[PDB]
Structures are given as structure tokens and as C-alpha cells.
Amino acid sequence: EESRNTTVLDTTTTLQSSGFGRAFFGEAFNDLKTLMRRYQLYGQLLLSVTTDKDIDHCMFTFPCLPQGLALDIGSAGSPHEIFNRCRDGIIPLIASGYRFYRGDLRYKIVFPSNVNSNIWVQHRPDRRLEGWSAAKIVNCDAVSTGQGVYNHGYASHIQITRVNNVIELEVPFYNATCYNYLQAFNASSAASSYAVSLGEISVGFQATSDDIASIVNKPVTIYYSIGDGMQFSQWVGYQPMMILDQLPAPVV
């Protein structure tokens, strides 16, 4: 069996327990769940207006899942240095260790400062993730479906950038499932696709196109953490790691 221990050959005299730093630093690091709630960078983008957007059009939409977005190094010419360098993170690294999850997420999107415009944020529980490809932030183009616009029923919230430019969130667990998939997802069942993302958040500015020019190529970093109610389930061993200090130097 895996955790069996046939015949211990103890040499150690007993070492003092430290309580995971409780005896030194004053804080236990035993529960890995409480570390999971330190916020992590989730995605990152430079806003890119394409079509002449109206008040209603979403500026970008991303699926919201604990697994972490499929990692986006960026194009070879313009890397997002943190994901290029600081690969993945903590929460996805532990999400690597389990096979199912059932819980909330929190986000705290940090909008660009220079813009003044109001910002709405839909949550869309309906949407199915459609394979691990296109599990990434998407800059929506011309409206053609209801995907591109504000919608009435979906839960939403509207930060006033002028007052404070970081809307904070609580994406809830709405799925008709026991508990969702947690590793990378290739979609076998067609109904397996409802079994991953908590929803499909959509951020959108209310700016008219005359003012939208200020917004172009302004950064919008995003954060996430597992939201207290989260509970990963089945243990599954780690897929091979790739040591970071061993990554190649830029070379002068």
C-alpha cells in the first residue's frame, strides 16, 4: 500500500514540535487551506478595443476556476514576465494535488487608474467551459450573441472607478454537480463541460467610444483566492514539476 510503513528504523531522539512556526513566528502554517486564501495573480491583460463598443459591450470575459487559467506566457515578443518566470503559482500548484473541488472564489480585480469610467462585472453560471483551450481571458469582439453584452438576470456589480478602482468579488458555487473537476480539462462528456468553471465572469466598461480611447492598453490585473468555503476532495499525486531556478538566463 502507499502509506504503509513496514519496519521503522528509528535513530532520532524526539525533536521538539514547533507547531509549524506557532512557537516562533506566532502563526501556524499547518492548514494549507488558510494559505490558499492569500491572494494570487490570476490573469493579466492590456485592454484592446477592436469594434466601436457601446455602453453595454463587455470589454473582456474569463472563466473563473480554482485550477488557475491556462498559463499565458504571452507572445514571444512581449512576454508577461511573471508567468514566464514565476511559473503558475501557489493555489494552482495545490489544485494540482487534488481531483475535485466544491467551493467559492474571490477576485478583487484591479482596474487601471487613469480611466474614470464606471465598470460592471457579470457572473454567468450558465456558461460551459469548452476544453482547456479557451480557458483564458478573452477580449470579446463584435456583438453577435448575448455573450458580448450586459444581461439582466445574471448576478452583477458595478464599481465606480472614480471612488475606488478595485472591485472585490465572491464568485459562488452554482453547478448541478456533486463537485467540479480540478486538474486540466479536455472535455470528454458534453455535460462534463459544466463540471469545471464556477461560471464565466465578464468585465465591461460603460464608456462611449469617444472616451474608450483612454482605456486602450491600460493594464487590468486580476487576483483570486479560494474563499473559505472551498474544499478540494480526492488526493492525486503531483504531475512532474519544473524547477524554477534552473530556467535559462536572458543572456547579455
Partner: protein, 250 residues
């Protein structure tokens, strides 16, 4: 202790495991490995229609795979990535006869939906002088996880709990496999919201941790056979068997 007295009977005790009308024996203690705590019944939340476990036939032991394991197999070498609810059907159909023929699997021919704990024994008959070691590892909904092709190696299944089958001891590997899946019930045929990946809880897989080693004139092969009980099951949604389609060939 330490007082052998073999007779015509032979030496050791023989522990059993009767179910319905199938008894099967192992001289050795099973190396049990139980991935999850036993499942709650869950017919309550998703089935008005008549529900019934068929304990007297579904719970019988029935073979699903068997395979030679020669010394030629290199260290990390899959012997069998069995799916389980499917292999119980896929093997029968692979053996060129319909699901209806086999008593264990008739309720699948009818009922639209299945749930329930599985049992899997991976019995072996290596000779005592052979040296080697299988691992048997159950991995829930493997197909859903696209990067699994990299994980699927003995270093990667040894981290999750897994049975070990030493060829020296000819040890038999018990493996309780309680239901866990994103959806409480597994369909047994094409169903309105999904088609592909039918009745696929996940996959048992038997990677080698140590290749057989033996004297040059010793016994090369080492056969293995894998029985599967399907115990605390329950079926729901009665439906005509003509809707049923033969399982994907695998």
C-alpha cells in the same frame, strides 16, 4: 509459530470471499487500498423512477482482464489501463457476445443510469522465485484530465494510494473503489446531455515498478487476472434495451 508441518493438504490457511454464488480464494493477504470513504446512496436527489440494486447478480465477481507479464516488459510499462464500469462491459463485448448474456451486466442493458461502489481484485500467480512488483492504481475520471499522459507513470501513481503486487509473494491486490464523479449517476447509454465518455468513472492502471527478474532458465511469464465486484450499486431510470449501444472498443 515457526513449526511447519505440510501434509497432503499443504501448509497454510486459505481465506475466502464469497458473494452471490461466486467464491474465490487467495492464499495471501490482500494488499487493500481504498481511495475514498464509502459513498452515500444518492438515489434520493435525482430519481423518482423505480430504483433497485440487484445484489443477487450485480455483486457477483466477474473477470474483466487478464494478461501475461513477461520479463521483456521494461520498468515503467503499462500492462492495462482498465476503465472499470466500461471494462466490465467492454471486455464482454470484446469477447464477441452481447451484454445481455452475462448475469452481472444485464441490468446495464436496461436501466439508463448507474451508481455504486466497485471492488476490484488483481490476482496473480507469480512463482515464489520470481522478483518483481506491479502497482495497481485507481485514478478518478482520468480521461477528463488532458495532462494525464505525463502523470501516467509509476512515480506519479505511487503518490496517491495504490495496491502493490509483489511477484515474489504472488500477492493479491484488493481495491475498493467507492463512487465519486462530478455527477452522482453514470449513464449506461447515450443520454441527452452527454454521449462520448459513456459510463466512465475513471481508470484502474497497473504500471510495473519492477520488471520480472529470474535465472536465465527460469519461468519467464507471469499471468495476471482481474475480477470486479460491483457491490453497493443502484440503478435508476428503466429503459428499453434497444437504445443500448455497444461500448467503445478501447
Amino acid at each position: 509459530m515457526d513449526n511447519p508441518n505440510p501434509g497432503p493438504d499443504g501448509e497454510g490457511e486459505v481465506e475466502l470471499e464469497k458473494d452471490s454464488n461466486v467464491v474465490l480464494t487467495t492464499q495471501r493477504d490482500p494488499s487493500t487500498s481504498i481511495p475514498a470513504p464509502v459513498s452515500v446512496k444518492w438515489s434520493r436527489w435525482t430519481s423518482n423512477d423505480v430504483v433497485d440494486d440487484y445484489a443477487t447478480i450485480t455483486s457477483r465477481w466477474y473477470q474483466i482482464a487478464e494478461f501475461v507479464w513477461s520479463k521483456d516488459d521494461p520498468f515503467d510499462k503499462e500492462l492495462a489501463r482498465l476503465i472499470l464500469p466500461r471494462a466490465l462491459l467492454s471486455s464482454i463485448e470484446a469477447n464477441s457476445d452481447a451484454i445481455c448474456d452475462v448475469p452481472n451486466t444485464i441490468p446495464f442493458k436496461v436501466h439508463a443510469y448507474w451508481r455504486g461502489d466497485m471492488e476490484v481484485r488483481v490476482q496473480i500467480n507469480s512463482n515464489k522465485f520470481q522478483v518483481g512488483q506491479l502497482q495497481a492504481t485507481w485514478y478518478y475520471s482520468d480521461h477528463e484530465n488532458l495532462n494525464i499522459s505525463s502523470k501516467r507513470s509509476v512515480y506519479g501513481f505511487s503518490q496517491m494510494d495504490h495496491a502493490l503486487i509483489s511477484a515474489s509473494a504472488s500477492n493479491e491486490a484488493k481495491l475498493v473503489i467507492p463512487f465519486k464523479h462530478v455527477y452522482p449517476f453514470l449513464p449506461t447509454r447515450i443520454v441527452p446531455d452527454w454521449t462520448t465518455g459513456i459510463l466512465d468513472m475513471g481508470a484502474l492502471n497497473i504500471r510495473v515498478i519492477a520488471p520480472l527478474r529470474m535465472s536465465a532458465t527460469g519461468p519467464t511469464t507471469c499471468n495476471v487476472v482481474v475480477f470486479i465486484k460491483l457491490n453497493n450499486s443502484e440503478f435508476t431510470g428503466t429503459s428499453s434495451g434497444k437504445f443500448y449501444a455497444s461500448q467503445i472498443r478501447a
